[PDB]
Amino acid sequence: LIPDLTLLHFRNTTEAGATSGSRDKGLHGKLRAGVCYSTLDVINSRHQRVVVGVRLQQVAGRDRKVDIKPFMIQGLPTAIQPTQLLTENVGERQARVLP
Amino acid sequence: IERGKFRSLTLVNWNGFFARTFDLDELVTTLSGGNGAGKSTTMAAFVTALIPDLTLLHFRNTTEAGATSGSRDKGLHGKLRAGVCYSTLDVINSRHQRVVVGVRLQQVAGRDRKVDIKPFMIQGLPTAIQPTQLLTENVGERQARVLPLNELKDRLDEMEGVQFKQFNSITDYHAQMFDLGVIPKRLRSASDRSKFYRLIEASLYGGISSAITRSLRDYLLPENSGVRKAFQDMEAALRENRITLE
Amino acid sequence: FMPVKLAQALANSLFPELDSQLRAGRHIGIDDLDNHAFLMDFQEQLEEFYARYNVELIRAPEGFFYLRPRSTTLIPRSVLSELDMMVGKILCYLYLSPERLANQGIFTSQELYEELISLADEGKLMKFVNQRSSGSDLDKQKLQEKVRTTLNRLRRLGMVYFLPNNNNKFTITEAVFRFGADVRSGDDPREIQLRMIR
Amino acid sequence: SSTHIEQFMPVKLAQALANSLFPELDSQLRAGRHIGIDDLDNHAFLMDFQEQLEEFYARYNVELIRAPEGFFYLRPRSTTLIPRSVLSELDMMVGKILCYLYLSPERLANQGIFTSQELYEELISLADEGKLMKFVNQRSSGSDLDKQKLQEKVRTTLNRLRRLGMVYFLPNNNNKFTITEAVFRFGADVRSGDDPREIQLRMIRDGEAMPV
Amino acid sequence: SSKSVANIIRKTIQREQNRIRMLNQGLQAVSFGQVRGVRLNVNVRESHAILLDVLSEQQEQHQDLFNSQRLTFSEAMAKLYQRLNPQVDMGQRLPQTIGEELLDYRNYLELDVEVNRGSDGWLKAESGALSTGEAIGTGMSILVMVVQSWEEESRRLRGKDISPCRLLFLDQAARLDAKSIATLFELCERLQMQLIIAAPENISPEKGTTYKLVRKVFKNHEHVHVVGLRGFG
Amino acid sequence: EELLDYRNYLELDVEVNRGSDGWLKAESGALSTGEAIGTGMSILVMVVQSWEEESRRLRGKDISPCRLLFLDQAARLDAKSIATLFELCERLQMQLIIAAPENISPEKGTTYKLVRKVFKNHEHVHVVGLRGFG
Amino acid sequence: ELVSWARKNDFSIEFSTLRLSMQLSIVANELHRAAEAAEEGGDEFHWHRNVFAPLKYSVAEIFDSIDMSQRLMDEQQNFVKEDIAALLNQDWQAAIANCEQLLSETSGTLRELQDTLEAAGDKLQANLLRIQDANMGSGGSELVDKLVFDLQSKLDRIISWGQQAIDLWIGYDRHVHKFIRTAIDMDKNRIFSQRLRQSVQHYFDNPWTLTVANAERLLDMRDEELALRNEEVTGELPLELEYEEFSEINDQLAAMIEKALLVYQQEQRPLDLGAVLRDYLAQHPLPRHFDVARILVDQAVRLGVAEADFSGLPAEWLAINDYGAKVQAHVIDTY
Amino acid sequence: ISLPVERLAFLMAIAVLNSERLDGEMSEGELIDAFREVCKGFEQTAESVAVRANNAINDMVRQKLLNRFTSELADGNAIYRLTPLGISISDYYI
DNA sequence: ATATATATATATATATATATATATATATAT
DNA sequence: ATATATATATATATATATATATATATATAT
Ligand SMILES: Nc1ncnc2c1ncn2[C@@H]1O[C@H](COP(=O)(O)OP(=O)(O)OP(=O)(O)O)[C@@H](O)[C@H]1O
């Protein structure tokens, strides 16, 4: 919903308003190596099926930093699910996430 | 050795509670009830009985735990009813001595929501005497009344074998409690009291208290005076050297 | 360096006496024309000068100036007795409108004594003199002597201007309003003052 | 020119009065506190701007005076703008005794750290026990209750002198103390080798000491 | 004097490290969420070991810094710490306070809390990288160790016949699941620790004692009615 | 500049009709956890409604922005409070995502059971879904 | 605890450095011999006769002797302080040289004792650590460790004092000089001292008092007296605690479902939540259906995972009854 | 040489603490605590704790049982050490 | 026609200094 | 013998300055 690194701080529920204590925002450790995606699907009052989303990547480096790229998709068929667009059903056991 | 135990917690004239005695468990005591039942009130009353330091007592909501809310009110005043209130603990010592520590709380008249607290201790009370009855006088038909500290002193002194003491400072109160195996650490200085309250406060809200983890060094490791003496010696040497150089 | 106007105010030949009287707690009202005008002119700098002492230079709504010590006050602080505030509130009440027809701004120790006896509760009077006392001659004489002593203490503060003679007859200044209560819309000053005193 | 400090106050006096140390020093001085070499910061502050402060305080009709021993203090004049007060005779006894202990080598092992008990023992050694006790209570004849009363009075006078800077309690102990050179003032009547009755008149004339 | 200082700090640090390392084995693999164990890591800080070495052997080489009239001893120590080991990059804290901090031996040890999360080994415990239940369990473990240490320290002053009472709290217990609460119960009973827990629902029906509170409005005031509960009927 | 803003001229307070007593100012310290949580949700929906009202005049006349809120550690609330919250959200056509560690079982809406496991030496969340009950 | 022991007992009533060197040498020989004997090893009796009888008694006695020498030096320091104090009473300005010499000799003696102490402290510590290393050669050598832990501190303790005393004395010394630089410099002839003494003795023949500034204290307004709330609260006292019992119906249902479901794990049969739930919910009335579904799922998800969940193909919402109940789950294959 | 039961017990406690003391130094700040504890155990209050402690320490110092050293930094601004006679008297029983 | 480096603005949160309130010791006075 | 005043220390919350990291628009090398 809000792809801004400044504001995103996933502190623990305990210490909901307390100071940082550490320097990490807690987002990097929730991701996995590679390219990841977080997408919402919305149906407007106009009934337009819109897929909003963000591509996330653990920025390789000394610190635990994350790169976020927003995106929107419009006009998708109602029969195609988000997991299908972002994943290739290769013959292997597990699918492949595409950039 | 047999470790002492907290037998029960008694609440007098509290918000919602007139005179209620919860008998604690050897291992675990649980309190349930819908929102606003008054469990947090019981916890607050206990801790008030344990550390009656008014500067430390701050009953923030579990939400905003440690987040400054700027209410200017510690929340204790609204948890008491008008008139006298009591909060007492019965403890069985490892010497198998039943000791009733406690505090008399009373709202201070005025716009400020300020409270006054007076600790006290009772030793040698017969095991058949319940604090709930000990603190109340049966006036009228099944209409017991609460009695003030002076009346309690008169009633107890008239009994045989019971020793009642009233403390003019929470320091002596903590010292006596420690003497009877009720507190792990001797809270000689105000910093010790602050650390103790920090520990129980973190426990009550539960989980990683920021202050604790930030001062874990102070909380775990003991203070050493030899290092301080050596540093002072080096300081004096450096001061003399600077004097000579100047 | 130092503020220039602050240096001017401190250098003024009136500054030593006024400073001593302020550090003694005296209240400077409109009656002291020279001192009041000096404080009016140089307040913006004397407030800072006395804030350097962790004290506040306060100009009351009535107009009189005074020094309020903070908790970190650098000027040795002291606290008035209970009888002192009681007597202060009595004089504040006596700063009344019928007072003009009653005493024309000049009261006598007897007026204060009778007002204090009739108006105050017996328990506080005993607490003043001693608890075990009960309506006796020696206790009343000691109470009168303490009343005179506290009247002198107020004189030290500028609350009461003695009429010059050994005899006890004085006048009440506006600064006494410090003991007074706040005024609301339509409230009778007499009623609020008595309610506070009770 | 206008808006210029020299118009009203000398530059160095204004600098001294604007220093962070001025307020505590002024409050202590007006309270009657003597300043010795131990308060290094305050003593140095007084030394640097000593002349400005004597002339400033002269406006109050009080002399900022530095005794030859090197300790500053305030002596009000008969026309003082700051009230004045005199020490009690018991205060003189304890101050003279304190000066003796400062100059006494027998107690050198103490290294300057003294307890009130030792001070009382020395006091009774050099003074007249019962005739000194007479002042504590007019009806004393050696009663131990009155003895404890005199001990308590000596302790109280010692505390007051501590307030005056003649003695410092130790950073953690209020039952032990270290003497300061200010105590030398208690010997101003004997520092000059002349007849006592002329030196007393000289001092009282100078305002150093009133009689009782 | 500087050499003697450094020596006494080193000895105290070694003694405290040994004590804490011996104490660590007083934990028995608590099960909280994916956290399988809690541990205390004590390690002498190299940034401070270098400082001790310089103090003990090379005091004179930096006398220029020590004997400056501008710097107090605390500030001198802070500046010396800055001089060597310059990559720490301390923040905006003033030299005076950081030096005063340097004057305490305990600061010289990194004292941190490690958790054996899942199968990732022992990782430093950060509230920002732990679930609510995991953090609650870790905090309880820390508090129990702290109270044990306090009891141990006072073992000398206290009489040989008294064991101090032990009691802790936990409000809003509903944040913990059944497994976590069972683990907490077994830990507390193994440590003879009394617990007072609160939750809107009875989360511990078959252990210890339980009470249920109901608040009733009654003639323009309130009353709380307390009813005991039992496991089986 | 503070005076130049009309909003500063207004004093805003949150009041609750707590029990037998009248309307009292909402102080975080004078309420239980559930009461504070509920009042917070109330004020949040107030804010959402106000924002929608403000933004309507700059939007297409036939656009109704989505409304969706969270509630973590919902177990702090009792069944009565949860039912009241559900009623409020329904009345306001507002979607809720509530997390509870199995303690509560809201019969209405969708429920998602999650369980963490190790599979192929990787952490995996087995997920099951239910809905329509009631 | 020793207070009661004492109460029931009812009881009541060589500074030469050559010495210190010779005790240190004797200690070195005995400690090295004991360390070598421990390192060589032996049976329990050999371990005893080589590390417990010889070491313990000898080291304890001679460390006590060294400590006794330090105590005798402490006595000598006290005596020299007293001698200096008495001398300054008799010569005043003429004892300055005597006191400076006495200070010089005492300082030199203290420094030589410290030097002799540190002449063997390090190597003795090394030998003691060696004995610590060799102690673990047997399981019954626990007591040895105590000595190897005890005989440490004493030694270090001794060395500590060897410096601490100097740290104290070098301090005290300064004071004496200060005294000479302050007490006697301005009272060279001491006449001021006698005259002060006579003034004290004959003060009240001319009682005089000094003058000091006594500025007034800033009188302040007393804060309002605090009055508590007194209302004599009365009310009904609570009755005896009632009790209620917890229903274990859900436990019985869970046991039923676990027994009914264990067959799938036993046979490793592919489990389909849709069909299983649809079949099983028919056995219960509609209002209970939810409380069943949940439980069943709780029991099913512990049994293996579903391989399709990694395919990226979402599962459908299969209906599991009438009235509109639905379930979304892939088939559980990998047990 | 005159050791009543209380003085003797205080001396024995001092010796025990010195034996268990790390570096073999005793500041008076701990001596006063030890005297308070022994007097509490013996259950006698002739005067205040402080005066009794001071009198006993001074008596032992003059009775050649303790040696005092003035150190301002030390807790209580003094450091006390057992004298050879005190060591002998203490270890005679211990 | 593109992507990286710069300058700008912003929120975060870190630290300091201030001011308040409470507890304590304890020294006075009736 | 105890009420009361006074000085000191600590914890706690407010307010302000400042360094850090990120987001956005423009400039300029590729
Ligand atoms: N200081 C106070 N002033 C006014 N009302 C209060 C105060 N403290 C508690 N209350 C009210 O008393 C009732 C019990 O509060 P309390 O926080 O003790 O409940 P609880 O059982 O802990 O609740 P929950 O589990 O929902 O947190 C609630 O109505 C609360 O609003």
Ligand SMILES: [Mg+2]
């Ligand atoms: Mg609650």
